[PDB]
Amino acid sequence: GPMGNGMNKILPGLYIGNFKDARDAEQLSKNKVTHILSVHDSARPMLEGVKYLCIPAADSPSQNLTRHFKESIKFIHECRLRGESCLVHCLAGVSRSVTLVIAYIMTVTDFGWEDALHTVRAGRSCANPNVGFQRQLQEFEKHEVHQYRQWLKEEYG
Ligand code: VO4
């Protein structure tokens, strides 16, 4: 469906879901989620015992998300390196959250944005960044993802 079927594993320790999944204590415990990246209009820490990164962003092609790629990647990566699980979510888990996860995948692999989106869709079929976000991912692939990959190597080995 258009808001998924529950939070979905994309990579070990990295999940995408909708806003309901993000407060579902059963899903959070089953998937051992200790970090939540909430990227939506009124994003704020909700549940105790979880570490949050909140990004106020609209699901509009006018919304810039590139400014937030580096902080999102750091947050996801530091959680995954300590063996913990991170959930990235927006309202529906289709566009804003997916775009941040694509940028992460692109940085930890040699994938362009389309192969990263394929990876997301294998776990979460509804994934579909809006056209403004697709444009931003294409510019990231052409001019910046190589800088982010080098940064990741120098920072984390
Ligand atoms: O709540 V999202 O529309 O960016 O899938």
mmCIF file of N, CA and C in Angstrom, residues 15-118:
data_model
loop_
_atom_site.group_PDB
_atom_site.id
_atom_site.type_symbol
_atom_site.label_atom_id
_atom_site.label_comp_id
_atom_site.label_asym_id
_atom_site.label_seq_id
_atom_site.Cartn_x
_atom_site.Cartn_y
_atom_site.Cartn_z
ATOM 1 N N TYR A 15 16.088 0.639 8.781
ATOM 2 C CA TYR A 15 14.683 0.397 8.497
ATOM 3 C C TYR A 15 14.037 1.692 8.031
ATOM 4 N N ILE A 16 13.006 1.559 7.202
ATOM 5 C CA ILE A 16 12.149 2.670 6.806
ATOM 6 C C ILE A 16 10.719 2.316 7.179
ATOM 7 N N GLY A 17 9.992 3.294 7.699
ATOM 8 C CA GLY A 17 8.581 3.107 7.932
ATOM 9 C C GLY A 17 7.800 4.404 7.871
ATOM 10 N N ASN A 18 6.527 4.298 8.251
ATOM 11 C CA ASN A 18 5.632 5.441 8.341
ATOM 12 C C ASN A 18 5.565 5.938 9.783
ATOM 13 N N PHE A 19 4.779 6.995 10.016
ATOM 14 C CA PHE A 19 4.798 7.618 11.338
ATOM 15 C C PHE A 19 4.205 6.693 12.391
ATOM 16 N N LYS A 20 3.268 5.819 11.995
ATOM 17 C CA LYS A 20 2.673 4.877 12.937
ATOM 18 C C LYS A 20 3.682 3.812 13.329
ATOM 19 N N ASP A 21 4.400 3.264 12.346
ATOM 20 C CA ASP A 21 5.475 2.323 12.646
ATOM 21 C C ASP A 21 6.459 2.907 13.649
ATOM 22 N N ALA A 22 6.757 4.201 13.525
ATOM 23 C CA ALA A 22 7.767 4.833 14.355
ATOM 24 C C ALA A 22 7.367 4.947 15.811
ATOM 25 N N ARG A 23 6.088 4.803 16.135
ATOM 26 C CA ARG A 23 5.676 4.778 17.526
ATOM 27 C C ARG A 23 5.120 3.421 17.924
ATOM 28 N N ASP A 24 5.292 2.409 17.077
ATOM 29 C CA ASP A 24 4.764 1.072 17.354
ATOM 30 C C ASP A 24 5.775 0.357 18.244
ATOM 31 N N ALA A 25 5.466 0.242 19.540
ATOM 32 C CA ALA A 25 6.423 -0.357 20.467
ATOM 33 C C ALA A 25 6.761 -1.792 20.082
ATOM 34 N N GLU A 26 5.811 -2.506 19.478
ATOM 35 C CA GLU A 26 6.057 -3.884 19.074
ATOM 36 C C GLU A 26 7.045 -3.954 17.923
ATOM 37 N N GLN A 27 6.889 -3.074 16.928
ATOM 38 C CA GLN A 27 7.823 -3.084 15.812
ATOM 39 C C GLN A 27 9.195 -2.614 16.264
ATOM 40 N N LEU A 28 9.239 -1.609 17.150
ATOM 41 C CA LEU A 28 10.522 -1.069 17.585
ATOM 42 C C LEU A 28 11.313 -2.104 18.366
ATOM 43 N N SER A 29 10.629 -2.889 19.201
ATOM 44 C CA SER A 29 11.336 -3.903 19.975
ATOM 45 C C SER A 29 11.715 -5.088 19.100
ATOM 46 N N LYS A 30 10.797 -5.541 18.243
ATOM 47 C CA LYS A 30 11.103 -6.656 17.351
ATOM 48 C C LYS A 30 12.319 -6.356 16.478
ATOM 49 N N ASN A 31 12.452 -5.114 16.006
ATOM 50 C CA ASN A 31 13.561 -4.737 15.142
ATOM 51 C C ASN A 31 14.719 -4.089 15.900
ATOM 52 N N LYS A 32 14.636 -4.024 17.233
ATOM 53 C CA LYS A 32 15.708 -3.507 18.092
ATOM 54 C C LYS A 32 16.108 -2.075 17.736
ATOM 55 N N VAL A 33 15.120 -1.243 17.449
ATOM 56 C CA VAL A 33 15.393 0.124 17.015
ATOM 57 C C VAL A 33 15.723 0.983 18.228
ATOM 58 N N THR A 34 16.916 1.583 18.228
ATOM 59 C CA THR A 34 17.327 2.496 19.283
ATOM 60 C C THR A 34 17.556 3.912 18.792
ATOM 61 N N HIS A 35 17.503 4.141 17.478
ATOM 62 C CA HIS A 35 17.750 5.442 16.878
ATOM 63 C C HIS A 35 16.643 5.678 15.868
ATOM 64 N N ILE A 36 16.063 6.876 15.877
ATOM 65 C CA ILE A 36 15.023 7.235 14.924
ATOM 66 C C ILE A 36 15.395 8.563 14.280
ATOM 67 N N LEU A 37 15.419 8.576 12.956
ATOM 68 C CA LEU A 37 15.594 9.788 12.163
ATOM 69 C C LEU A 37 14.212 10.153 11.642
ATOM 70 N N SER A 38 13.623 11.213 12.206
ATOM 71 C CA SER A 38 12.279 11.659 11.861
ATOM 72 C C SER A 38 12.414 12.854 10.919
ATOM 73 N N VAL A 39 12.001 12.685 9.679
ATOM 74 C CA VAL A 39 12.152 13.752 8.686
ATOM 75 C C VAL A 39 10.760 14.101 8.172
ATOM 76 N N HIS A 40 10.138 15.103 8.788
ATOM 77 C CA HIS A 40 8.793 15.514 8.397
ATOM 78 C C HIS A 40 8.508 16.865 9.041
ATOM 79 N N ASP A 41 7.281 17.350 8.833
ATOM 80 C CA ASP A 41 6.955 18.746 9.115
ATOM 81 C C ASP A 41 7.181 19.104 10.584
ATOM 82 N N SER A 42 6.580 18.354 11.501
ATOM 83 C CA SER A 42 6.622 18.680 12.924
ATOM 84 C C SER A 42 7.498 17.713 13.718
ATOM 85 N N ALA A 43 8.600 17.261 13.124
ATOM 86 C CA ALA A 43 9.389 16.192 13.728
ATOM 87 C C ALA A 43 9.942 16.607 15.087
ATOM 88 N N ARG A 44 9.749 15.743 16.082
ATOM 89 C CA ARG A 44 10.195 15.977 17.446
ATOM 90 C C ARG A 44 10.369 14.628 18.128
ATOM 91 N N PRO A 45 11.249 14.535 19.124
ATOM 92 C CA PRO A 45 11.397 13.273 19.857
ATOM 93 C C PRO A 45 10.099 12.913 20.559
ATOM 94 N N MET A 46 9.687 11.659 20.402
ATOM 95 C CA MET A 46 8.439 11.186 20.983
ATOM 96 C C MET A 46 8.678 10.228 22.141
ATOM 97 N N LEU A 47 9.347 9.113 21.892
ATOM 98 C CA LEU A 47 9.401 8.013 22.842
ATOM 99 C C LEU A 47 10.675 8.062 23.675
ATOM 100 N N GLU A 48 10.544 7.747 24.960
ATOM 101 C CA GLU A 48 11.727 7.672 25.799
ATOM 102 C C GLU A 48 12.554 6.441 25.435
ATOM 103 N N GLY A 49 13.858 6.520 25.700
ATOM 104 C CA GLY A 49 14.756 5.419 25.434
ATOM 105 C C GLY A 49 15.249 5.332 24.012
ATOM 106 N N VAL A 50 14.859 6.273 23.155
ATOM 107 C CA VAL A 50 15.270 6.304 21.757
ATOM 108 C C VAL A 50 16.030 7.600 21.510
ATOM 109 N N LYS A 51 17.118 7.509 20.740
ATOM 110 C CA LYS A 51 17.878 8.674 20.299
ATOM 111 C C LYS A 51 17.325 9.156 18.963
ATOM 112 N N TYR A 52 17.043 10.452 18.860
ATOM 113 C CA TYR A 52 16.367 11.022 17.701
ATOM 114 C C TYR A 52 17.255 12.021 16.972
ATOM 115 N N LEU A 53 17.113 12.056 15.645
ATOM 116 C CA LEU A 53 17.555 13.162 14.806
ATOM 117 C C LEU A 53 16.302 13.634 14.088
ATOM 118 N N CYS A 54 15.905 14.880 14.320
ATOM 119 C CA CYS A 54 14.682 15.419 13.747
ATOM 120 C C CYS A 54 15.057 16.445 12.693
ATOM 121 N N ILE A 55 14.490 16.288 11.503
ATOM 122 C CA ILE A 55 14.754 17.169 10.374
ATOM 123 C C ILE A 55 13.419 17.741 9.927
ATOM 124 N N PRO A 56 13.217 19.040 10.066
ATOM 125 C CA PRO A 56 11.976 19.661 9.585
ATOM 126 C C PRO A 56 12.048 19.845 8.082
ATOM 127 N N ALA A 57 11.279 19.040 7.352
ATOM 128 C CA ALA A 57 11.300 19.089 5.898
ATOM 129 C C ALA A 57 9.914 18.790 5.341
ATOM 130 N N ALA A 58 9.554 19.478 4.255
ATOM 131 C CA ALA A 58 8.308 19.217 3.553
ATOM 132 C C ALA A 58 8.541 18.191 2.452
ATOM 133 N N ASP A 59 7.484 17.451 2.102
ATOM 134 C CA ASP A 59 7.538 16.557 0.941
ATOM 135 C C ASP A 59 7.143 17.315 -0.326
ATOM 136 N N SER A 60 7.939 18.326 -0.630
ATOM 137 C CA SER A 60 7.713 19.156 -1.797
ATOM 138 C C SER A 60 8.991 19.215 -2.614
ATOM 139 N N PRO A 61 8.880 19.307 -3.942
ATOM 140 C CA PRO A 61 10.091 19.467 -4.758
ATOM 141 C C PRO A 61 10.870 20.727 -4.422
ATOM 142 N N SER A 62 10.236 21.713 -3.776
ATOM 143 C CA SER A 62 10.952 22.906 -3.351
ATOM 144 C C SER A 62 11.759 22.688 -2.078
ATOM 145 N N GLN A 63 11.533 21.585 -1.362
ATOM 146 C CA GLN A 63 12.240 21.349 -0.113
ATOM 147 C C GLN A 63 13.636 20.837 -0.414
ATOM 148 N N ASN A 64 14.639 21.500 0.147
ATOM 149 C CA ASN A 64 15.996 21.008 0.029
ATOM 150 C C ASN A 64 16.237 19.956 1.104
ATOM 151 N N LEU A 65 16.751 18.800 0.687
ATOM 152 C CA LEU A 65 17.214 17.782 1.616
ATOM 153 C C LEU A 65 18.717 17.578 1.562
ATOM 154 N N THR A 66 19.396 18.095 0.531
ATOM 155 C CA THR A 66 20.833 17.867 0.411
ATOM 156 C C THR A 66 21.590 18.456 1.592
ATOM 157 N N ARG A 67 21.139 19.611 2.097
ATOM 158 C CA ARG A 67 21.766 20.230 3.262
ATOM 159 C C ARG A 67 21.832 19.277 4.447
ATOM 160 N N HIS A 68 20.959 18.264 4.476
ATOM 161 C CA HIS A 68 20.835 17.341 5.599
ATOM 162 C C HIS A 68 21.456 15.972 5.352
ATOM 163 N N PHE A 69 22.010 15.712 4.166
ATOM 164 C CA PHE A 69 22.587 14.397 3.873
ATOM 165 C C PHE A 69 23.702 14.037 4.852
ATOM 166 N N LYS A 70 24.641 14.950 5.088
ATOM 167 C CA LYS A 70 25.806 14.593 5.883
ATOM 168 C C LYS A 70 25.417 14.260 7.323
ATOM 169 N N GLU A 71 24.571 15.089 7.938
ATOM 170 C CA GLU A 71 24.161 14.807 9.313
ATOM 171 C C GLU A 71 23.346 13.521 9.402
ATOM 172 N N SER A 72 22.540 13.237 8.384
ATOM 173 C CA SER A 72 21.768 11.996 8.363
ATOM 174 C C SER A 72 22.681 10.792 8.230
ATOM 175 N N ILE A 73 23.697 10.888 7.375
ATOM 176 C CA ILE A 73 24.587 9.756 7.156
ATOM 177 C C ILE A 73 25.398 9.470 8.413
ATOM 178 N N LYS A 74 25.899 10.522 9.067
ATOM 179 C CA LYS A 74 26.634 10.351 10.316
ATOM 180 C C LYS A 74 25.782 9.645 11.358
ATOM 181 N N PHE A 75 24.543 10.099 11.512
ATOM 182 C CA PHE A 75 23.635 9.527 12.498
ATOM 183 C C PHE A 75 23.371 8.053 12.212
ATOM 184 N N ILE A 76 23.054 7.723 10.961
ATOM 185 C CA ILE A 76 22.783 6.333 10.604
ATOM 186 C C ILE A 76 24.028 5.487 10.795
ATOM 187 N N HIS A 77 25.165 5.983 10.295
ATOM 188 C CA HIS A 77 26.375 5.176 10.278
ATOM 189 C C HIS A 77 26.886 4.890 11.681
ATOM 190 N N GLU A 78 26.881 5.897 12.556
ATOM 191 C CA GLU A 78 27.358 5.674 13.914
ATOM 192 C C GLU A 78 26.454 4.711 14.668
ATOM 193 N N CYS A 79 25.160 4.696 14.356
ATOM 194 C CA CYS A 79 24.275 3.715 14.974
ATOM 195 C C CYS A 79 24.600 2.315 14.465
ATOM 196 N N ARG A 80 24.736 2.159 13.151
ATOM 197 C CA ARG A 80 24.999 0.846 12.572
ATOM 198 C C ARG A 80 26.369 0.304 12.977
ATOM 199 N N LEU A 81 27.373 1.172 13.125
ATOM 200 C CA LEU A 81 28.700 0.694 13.518
ATOM 201 C C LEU A 81 28.707 0.096 14.921
ATOM 202 N N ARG A 82 27.856 0.581 15.827
ATOM 203 C CA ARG A 82 27.764 -0.047 17.144
ATOM 204 C C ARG A 82 26.742 -1.183 17.206
ATOM 205 N N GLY A 83 26.336 -1.714 16.053
ATOM 206 C CA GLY A 83 25.464 -2.870 15.975
ATOM 207 C C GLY A 83 24.008 -2.602 16.277
ATOM 208 N N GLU A 84 23.613 -1.338 16.376
ATOM 209 C CA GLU A 84 22.251 -0.951 16.704
ATOM 210 C C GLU A 84 21.456 -0.709 15.420
ATOM 211 N N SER A 85 20.144 -0.536 15.557
ATOM 212 C CA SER A 85 19.273 -0.351 14.403
ATOM 213 C C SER A 85 18.671 1.045 14.407
ATOM 214 N N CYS A 86 18.607 1.632 13.213
ATOM 215 C CA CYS A 86 18.063 2.962 12.973
ATOM 216 C C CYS A 86 16.816 2.873 12.102
ATOM 217 N N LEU A 87 15.763 3.571 12.500
ATOM 218 C CA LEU A 87 14.566 3.702 11.679
ATOM 219 C C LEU A 87 14.575 5.118 11.126
ATOM 220 N N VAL A 88 14.401 5.245 9.811
ATOM 221 C CA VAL A 88 14.188 6.541 9.171
ATOM 222 C C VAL A 88 12.729 6.580 8.743
ATOM 223 N N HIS A 89 11.997 7.634 9.115
ATOM 224 C CA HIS A 89 10.590 7.669 8.729
ATOM 225 C C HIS A 89 10.147 9.092 8.419
ATOM 226 N N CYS A 90 9.085 9.190 7.625
ATOM 227 C CA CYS A 90 8.361 10.446 7.448
ATOM 228 C C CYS A 90 6.906 10.146 7.769
ATOM 229 N N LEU A 91 5.949 10.794 7.110
ATOM 230 C CA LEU A 91 4.562 10.423 7.344
ATOM 231 C C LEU A 91 4.255 9.060 6.726
ATOM 232 N N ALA A 92 4.613 8.881 5.448
ATOM 233 C CA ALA A 92 4.271 7.681 4.689
ATOM 234 C C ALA A 92 5.435 6.719 4.480
ATOM 235 N N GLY A 93 6.670 7.152 4.687
ATOM 236 C CA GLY A 93 7.813 6.301 4.376
ATOM 237 C C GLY A 93 8.047 6.079 2.894
ATOM 238 N N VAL A 94 7.718 7.060 2.061
ATOM 239 C CA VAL A 94 7.805 6.921 0.614
ATOM 240 C C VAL A 94 8.814 7.882 -0.006
ATOM 241 N N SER A 95 8.941 9.101 0.531
ATOM 242 C CA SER A 95 9.646 10.127 -0.217
ATOM 243 C C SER A 95 10.779 10.767 0.593
ATOM 244 N N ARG A 96 10.455 11.503 1.655
ATOM 245 C CA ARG A 96 11.498 12.190 2.421
ATOM 246 C C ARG A 96 12.474 11.204 3.060
ATOM 247 N N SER A 97 11.940 10.209 3.774
ATOM 248 C CA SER A 97 12.803 9.249 4.461
ATOM 249 C C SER A 97 13.598 8.426 3.461
ATOM 250 N N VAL A 98 12.948 8.028 2.370
ATOM 251 C CA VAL A 98 13.600 7.247 1.332
ATOM 252 C C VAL A 98 14.773 8.003 0.735
ATOM 253 N N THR A 99 14.623 9.321 0.537
ATOM 254 C CA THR A 99 15.698 10.109 -0.073
ATOM 255 C C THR A 99 16.944 10.103 0.807
ATOM 256 N N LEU A 100 16.759 10.254 2.123
ATOM 257 C CA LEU A 100 17.908 10.214 3.027
ATOM 258 C C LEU A 100 18.563 8.840 3.021
ATOM 259 N N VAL A 101 17.763 7.775 2.986
ATOM 260 C CA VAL A 101 18.333 6.431 2.968
ATOM 261 C C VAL A 101 19.073 6.157 1.655
ATOM 262 N N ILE A 102 18.541 6.655 0.534
ATOM 263 C CA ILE A 102 19.261 6.525 -0.731
ATOM 264 C C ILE A 102 20.634 7.188 -0.629
ATOM 265 N N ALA A 103 20.696 8.401 -0.067
ATOM 266 C CA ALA A 103 21.990 9.071 0.031
ATOM 267 C C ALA A 103 22.953 8.262 0.888
ATOM 268 N N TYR A 104 22.439 7.648 1.961
ATOM 269 C CA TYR A 104 23.272 6.784 2.795
ATOM 270 C C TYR A 104 23.810 5.607 1.995
ATOM 271 N N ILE A 105 22.917 4.904 1.288
ATOM 272 C CA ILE A 105 23.337 3.742 0.509
ATOM 273 C C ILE A 105 24.386 4.132 -0.517
ATOM 274 N N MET A 106 24.178 5.270 -1.177
ATOM 275 C CA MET A 106 25.123 5.725 -2.193
ATOM 276 C C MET A 106 26.504 5.954 -1.600
ATOM 277 N N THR A 107 26.556 6.423 -0.350
ATOM 278 C CA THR A 107 27.816 6.733 0.321
ATOM 279 C C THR A 107 28.534 5.491 0.835
ATOM 280 N N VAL A 108 27.814 4.417 1.199
ATOM 281 C CA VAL A 108 28.446 3.212 1.740
ATOM 282 C C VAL A 108 28.630 2.117 0.696
ATOM 283 N N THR A 109 28.281 2.385 -0.566
ATOM 284 C CA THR A 109 28.465 1.466 -1.685
ATOM 285 C C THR A 109 29.052 2.282 -2.830
ATOM 286 N N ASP A 110 29.195 1.683 -4.014
ATOM 287 C CA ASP A 110 29.512 2.446 -5.216
ATOM 288 C C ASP A 110 28.280 2.744 -6.070
ATOM 289 N N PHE A 111 27.083 2.732 -5.477
ATOM 290 C CA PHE A 111 25.851 2.835 -6.255
ATOM 291 C C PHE A 111 25.519 4.283 -6.586
ATOM 292 N N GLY A 112 25.022 4.494 -7.802
ATOM 293 C CA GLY A 112 24.300 5.708 -8.114
ATOM 294 C C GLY A 112 22.925 5.681 -7.464
ATOM 295 N N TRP A 113 22.189 6.778 -7.644
ATOM 296 C CA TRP A 113 20.918 6.909 -6.948
ATOM 297 C C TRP A 113 19.887 5.904 -7.432
ATOM 298 N N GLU A 114 19.921 5.522 -8.709
ATOM 299 C CA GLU A 114 18.907 4.595 -9.193
ATOM 300 C C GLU A 114 19.133 3.194 -8.645
ATOM 301 N N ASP A 115 20.389 2.748 -8.557
ATOM 302 C CA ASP A 115 20.655 1.455 -7.935
ATOM 303 C C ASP A 115 20.367 1.482 -6.434
ATOM 304 N N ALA A 116 20.603 2.624 -5.782
ATOM 305 C CA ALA A 116 20.235 2.747 -4.374
ATOM 306 C C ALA A 116 18.722 2.693 -4.197
ATOM 307 N N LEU A 117 17.981 3.359 -5.076
ATOM 308 C CA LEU A 117 16.529 3.279 -5.009
ATOM 309 C C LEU A 117 16.042 1.853 -5.241
ATOM 310 N N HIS A 118 16.689 1.123 -6.162
ATOM 311 C CA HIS A 118 16.336 -0.277 -6.363
ATOM 312 C C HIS A 118 16.519 -1.074 -5.077
#
